[PDB]
Design a protein around this ligand. Structure first.
Ligand SMILES: [Ca+2]
Ligand SMILES: [Ca+2]
Ligand SMILES: [Ca+2]
Ligand SMILES: [Ca+2]
Lengths: 82, 37, 395, 48, 34, 48
């Protein structure tokens, strides 16, 4: 639906079932997106920082952070950590 | 949507102008034309 | 950076101004709401209010410091302040539809909206920890010689201003902040001269600008317009309302009408000015016993706004207005107050400039004038709620 | 905010890594002066 | 006119064609001012 | 005010005395690790 419990701008159902970011807005995942190069993300819908690192789920998934961070640190389940 | 009144990154240049080409005159971004060169 | 800048300002403030600022920091909402609608009461009512001292201290503290160049300020505004009652998007939604964007666009196409209260603004664009309560973001350019009071509140250097102008929106675009769509508006301030309660200043200005107006009047037409405004203005207006020149043509009153129009046209208003007039139900096609005249219930105000807000107006007769905005016993029953902005160069004159009881700060406007209603808002007057209409005179 | 050039608090080290990560380096040598540039390049693996 | 593109209290046309400051206000230049 | 963690200015010495004053201390020794705890206790002389 439109519930966002942790206020990270990703709805609870998208976090629970899967999502991706395009045009800086979270959208529902579809299996046809994998051919275009998109990645399917899941995260904690009760926690704004699923991995505990200084960046929220939206920032990581959207890449709205330092561009020197590796690309695998973009899904919420892998931490950005030196 | 279907008009040149979008600024997604909020940097005073419309999305399509950045996408296709633009130039600045009188501190305002304008759509590019070949005769400007 | 701004902490010593806030200090250098507060040091030179009075102890009364300091405690007024503290009381604002504790109970900002009620003080702002009071400052918005404070000048529409009686003369003695606004004197005995238990919050007028705070308003005076705060306005003096704000106006003590002024800026020397135009600069841009950033704040979030409720979209209904610009007469858009529908919702752009809910507070949990993430996207703005194209239809909502278009509706907001033709809602604010060519209009001026007045802001008349205290406001908390920022000199920098909203970032990460900043509160974002509305889907509308405003980029306003303040004019030169406007007051700002930068005060520290829990470390955060906040800035406080008082609004006394009318703003117009130039361009709107849709932006993304942290994965949410926002409507960003570029606005500019249109300066105007507004004497809200201090009728003394307005009277002095009108005297200085129209006491020599009689001299430019030819003596015969001077006595002619004078005799009109003493005794026959009611008769002339009643003849004009009934469309007399069209229904029962006669030159005797057409001569009076032409003389009045020419005399008003002789010397126009030199500066953008705002006038206040209390209007009756017959002007809006209502009766005193009509149920919609009761503005206590929400549906009456909603219907009145839906049928009147954004539309035009036309007064075949002449319009009688006063510079002041205070309530008078002559029109105490009038639940509808009309706020009119006079563009510079429009015809008109200050009747009270001439000696004698010319009226109560009377300003007359040419007959057949048309008006556009921008926004309509409500305020409570004791046990009843009165209605305020904001309008602009068009040439 | 007042329109004056402020320099303290701005550091190039905050941007060195980010500029190097997303750019290509081009150097022109000539004979009397050397020029080093970074030009932004596109990541074909990211559709966004 | 009254366009001020750079927001420096001087209108664009005055800056283009010449101006002077009297009573802290920019005015159009006239040759009798010299 | 944002989601960032701050440790500067947060000191345990401001709470050490307050915690020690209203608590009972319990220790479990085990064999390869020790545990020390503080548990809040009720004051029966104060009706509030
Ligand atoms: Ca969420
Ligand atoms: Ca989350
Ligand atoms: Ca852009
Ligand atoms: Ca200029």
């Amino acid at each position: 639906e439109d519930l966002d419990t942790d206020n990270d701008n990703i709805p609870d159902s998208y976090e629970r079932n899967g999502y991706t970011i395009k045009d800086l807005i979270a959208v529902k995942w579809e299996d046809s997106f994998a051919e275009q190069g998109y990645k399917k993300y899941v995260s904690n819908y009760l926690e704004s920082n699923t991995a505990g690192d200084p960046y929220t789920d939206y920032e990581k998934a959207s890449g709205s952070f330092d561009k020197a961070i590796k690309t695998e640190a973009r899904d919420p389940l892998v931490a950005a950590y030196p | 949507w279907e008009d040149e009144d979008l600024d997604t990154d909020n940097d005073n240049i419309p999305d399509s102008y950045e996408r296709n080409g633009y130039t600045i005159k009188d501190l305002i971004a304008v759509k590019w034309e070949d005769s400007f060169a | 950076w701004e902490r010593k800048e806030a200090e250098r300002i507060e040091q030179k403030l009075e102890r009364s101004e300091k405690e007024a600022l503290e009381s604002y920091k504790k109970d900002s909402v009620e003080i702002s709401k009071y400052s918005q609608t404070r000048n529409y009461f009686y003369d003695y009512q606004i004197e005995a209010n238990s919050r007028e001292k705070e308003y005076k201290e705060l306005r003096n503290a704000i106006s003590k410091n002024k800026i020397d160049k135009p600069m841009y300020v950033y704040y979030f505004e409720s979209p209904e302040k610009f007469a858009f009652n529908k919702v752009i998007r809910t507070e949990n939604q993430n996207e703005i539809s194209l239809e909502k964007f278009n509706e907001f666009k033709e809602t604010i196409q060519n209009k001026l909206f007045k802001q008349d209260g205290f406001k908390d603004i920022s000199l920098y664009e909203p970032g990460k920890g900043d509160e974002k309560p509305t889907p509308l973001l405003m980029h306003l350019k303040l004019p030169r010689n406007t007051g700002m009071l930068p005060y520290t509140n829990t470390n955060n250097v906040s800035t406080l201003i008082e609004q006394g102008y009318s703003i117009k929106i130039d361009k709107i675009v849709r932006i993304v902040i942290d994965g949410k769509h926002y409507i960003k508006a570029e606005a500019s301030v249109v300066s105007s001269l507004d004497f809200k309660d201090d009728v003394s200043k307005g009277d002095s200005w009108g005297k200085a600008n129209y006491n020599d107006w009689s001299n430019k009047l030819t003596p015969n037409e001077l006595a002619d317009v004078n005799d009109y405004m003493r005794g026959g203005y009611t008769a002339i207006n009643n003849y004009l309302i009934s469309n007399g020149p069209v229904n029962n043509p006669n030159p005797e009153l057409d001569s009076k009408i032409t003389n009045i129009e020419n005399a008003l046209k002789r010397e126009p208003i030199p500066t953008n000015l705002t006038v206040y007039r209390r209007s009756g139900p017959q002007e809006f096609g209502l009766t005193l016993t009509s149920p919609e005249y009761d503005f206590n219930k929400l549906e009456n105000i909603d219907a009145f706004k839906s049928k009147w807000e954004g539309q035009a107006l036309s007064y075949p007769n002449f319009i009688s207005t006063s510079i002041g905005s205070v309530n008078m016993s002559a029109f105490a029953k009038r639940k509808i107050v009309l706020r009119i902005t006079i563009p510079k160069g429009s015809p008109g004159a200050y009747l009270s400039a001439i000696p004698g009881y010319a009226g109560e700060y009377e300003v007359l406007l040419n007959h057949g004038s048309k008006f556009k209603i921008n926004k309509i808002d409500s305020y409570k007057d004791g046990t009843i709620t009165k209605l305020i209409v904001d309008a602009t005179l068009i040439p | 905010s007042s329109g004056q050039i402020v320099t303290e608090g701005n550091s190039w080290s905050d941007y060195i890594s980010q500029i190097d990560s997303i750019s290509a380096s081009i150097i022109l040598d000539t004979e009397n002066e050397s020029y080093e540039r970074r030009v932004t390049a596109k990541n074909l693996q990211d559709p966004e």
